[PDB]
Design an enzyme around this catalytic site. Structure first.
Site, PDB file in Angstrom:
ATOM      1  N   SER C 129      28.488  36.537  42.049  1.00 46.49           N
ATOM      2  CA  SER C 129      29.575  36.695  41.089  1.00 46.49           C
ATOM      3  C   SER C 129      29.880  35.333  40.473  1.00 46.49           C
ATOM      4  CB  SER C 129      30.806  37.223  41.837  1.00 46.49           C
ATOM      5  OG  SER C 129      32.008  37.006  41.130  1.00 46.49           O
ATOM      6  N   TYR C 144      36.812  38.041  48.479  1.00 45.29           N
ATOM      7  CA  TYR C 144      35.638  38.318  47.659  1.00 45.29           C
ATOM      8  C   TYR C 144      34.977  36.995  47.265  1.00 45.29           C
ATOM      9  CZ  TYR C 144      32.909  40.531  43.895  1.00 45.29           C
ATOM     10  OH  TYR C 144      31.919  40.981  43.050  1.00 45.29           O
TER      11      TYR C 144
END
Lengths: 239, 239, 239, 239
Positions: C129, C144
């Site tokens: 990401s 995350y």
């Protein structure tokens, strides 16, 4: 003083703050810029008037050597920029930015190393930016971005080569600092707002806050710290 | 003392050196480890016997708070490792490494932040490695590598969230340091030689040299330095 | 088909697009998720219903092996998140995110490698990401962020260990993509606007655009590409 | 052909392999170098004899435009180096390396962009190195290291500025490849052995293996991939 230091761009902004912090550590400092007189007298430093955009770098280092009685630390904090997008930027403007920021960095370090090696101890501190890792966001500064990123490669290369000589070489990457140079940015909210929104600490730095870390990288604290970039940006890059 | 600090893994190696450097800065330090007694008495620190691989982290932070009369600094220097390749590593061994290095880092920071916020000033220092940026080379340490790299993400995330509370969060990444923990590496030349050949300075670091920088990241010098990793590796990564 | 591939989270968003791109390359693909039926039938893939948040990863790999008649490629695109700041996040929620994203990544790769080694050719593709390099900006996603950053360390570690076995391991880092998962973000301008302003291309990506690169990293194009992260973010990180 | 591409340094090593891969994708390619004749005839490309170390870059781009009937892709693969340590390197030698690798990169891209913008689609591919991230290890190449690192900043800057014009800009970073240029390195074991020991795959790359990825970065696969560096090094950097 004991350790001898040369700080370019030492009469204004970050450069001046670094010179002040070094004097505070008891170093004998020389300030180089076009008009270093007032700053040198205020800080208690040796003034070395020079136009690093045109004068031979080797000449400045030699003057620093003879003026300080040695040379242990080099901080290249000189500043200059042509804030124009790539398609509007001329090659002369490109080379002007790259010359002062990178070419002069190389020339100054190359000339200084032998004296640091002679002393058996040295500190080279190049000045980076958040643009060493990004492209400046809303600001069009492709030349500056390229130069400040190139300094990371130079930093690693010189650190590798001079480590055994007692020289440590690092890149101090200041975030958004309140200085005369950045004044035109803190100007219109169009630029200041978006940038500041990305700074976790919610404020721009004071030159003295950046200098605290510069002093460390110019001291015994960096004995085993070399070939690295250190970002002091209030969290901007981590955002 | 003024600033209160908790240092896990503070009875041996890097952790002990960091605790010593902090005491030197005039901080009131608490050392946590399974057997902190001797180190605490030698350094002039408060001992907090604990098994961070099993005891509730929140409990250690509360004990530190009440033992020091506050909590401003947190350094998670506890160590543990299972040097086995991925295909030979069990899930239990994997979780053991990730638990102590990452899960405990999170739990300790989470418990400490409110007290730092209460004081309006805090410093969280996680301990990384060259494996925060590489895979360890000739050494098979996939779990450790993953954990130390994960800490960079945690560092950025917590720095972003707690910046406005007066808390700075960074990751100190030591290179190859002479400690009991790394002794089995400096052992056979098969590993020591290849690694050392990549260290520009040509030698491993002494724990005290790493601690100099740790102290900086736990002090006012880091006022505008947050969400960053700082590698003190004698030039290994730059090589 | 020739090359056999297992794609977790392959019934929705990026995972589904990757599965589709792989089928397009002529691979025999197996899609794993809680409800893979419809997607598998639409894409012409083998469905493998599973709850990777609870079912043994080794079991899924074995089912994939026997269902495809081999195993050459592994793409862990399963998704899950608890968007809460660190001080509001529970340890159970923390472990939930880290378990699915990191622990399962390890377990799946560990179980798959021997089969890829048996074939003498393999591709492991982890999904990163922009938070593999930053903290998510206006979005509170510490768990995350930590997980996606940890994957970079795992990627380097496994790549190093399995290179001689014919296995290449990389981390595909998608930027801001239009999927059901990110829908709650494209929601309020409070988040969508600031983020999009930092994307040079001025738009979010379509899942298929991310999949083009995923296919490359799962093909012969990556023969000499391993242990790296590849960001496909429309310029977000470079901004 | 449809897409028009200009590849500098396209008659030898990596540059030639990239030109060949592009022709394979059905692109109309022009090869630029001092002696491109033989390569152009062999590959089925248009030859553009030039000395990029002295000839005006804008002139080469204009010749490419008129020779191909357009310009969509630019790959600056020209090579040159002065393998001397910083203290033994002259300023002229320094500028020679920086000029060809960085200054020419800027000039070529600047001249090409308007034509790519006119077409509404473009791909700029700069060539990096492992020295974009390290200092070359046992090899003394400070100028090359600085230049290849500087390209990462240029890449990010141009990507940001030209994204809305349909142009994607990236940096392909090849590892250790078997080419005539690197032949003097694969020479003595003093250099080849230490380097190769750090390559997980245990071998140097073939130019064609690097070109596979170059083609991707010059194609629709990179539609949402811009401002990034992509290392194809057999795992060297991850080691």
């Amino acid at each position: 003083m004991e350790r001898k230091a040369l700080v370019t761009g030492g009469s204004r902004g970050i450069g001046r703050a670094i010179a002040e912090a070094l004097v505070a550590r008891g170093y004998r400092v020389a300030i180089a810029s076009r008009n270093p007189e007032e700053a040198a007298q205020s800080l208690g430093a040796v003034p070395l008037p020079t136009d690093l955009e045109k004068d031979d770098p080797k000449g400045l280092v030699k003057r620093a050597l003879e003026a300080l009685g040695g040379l242990h630390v080099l901080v290249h904090a000189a500043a200059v920029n042509v804030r124009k997008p790539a398609l509007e930027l001329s090659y002369e403007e490109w080379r002007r930015v790259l010359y002062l920021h990178l070419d002069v960095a190389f020339l100054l370090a190359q000339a200084a190393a032998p004296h640091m090696a002679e002393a058996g101890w040295g500190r080279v501190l190049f000045i980076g930016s958040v643009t060493t890792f990004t492209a400046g966001g809303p600001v069009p500064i492709p030349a500056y971005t390229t130069a400040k990123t190139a300094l990371l490669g130079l930093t690693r290369a010189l650190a590798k080569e001079w480590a055994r000589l007692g020289i440590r070489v690092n890149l101090l990457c200041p975030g958004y600092v309140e200085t005369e140079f950045t004044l035109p940015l803190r100007q219109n909210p169009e630029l200041y707002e978006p940038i500041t929104a990305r700074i976790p600490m919610g404020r721009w730095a004071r030159p003295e806050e950046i200098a605290r870390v510069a002093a460390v990288l110019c001291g015994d604290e960096a004995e085993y710290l070399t070939g690295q970039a250190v970002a002091v940006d209030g969290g901007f890059l981590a955002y």
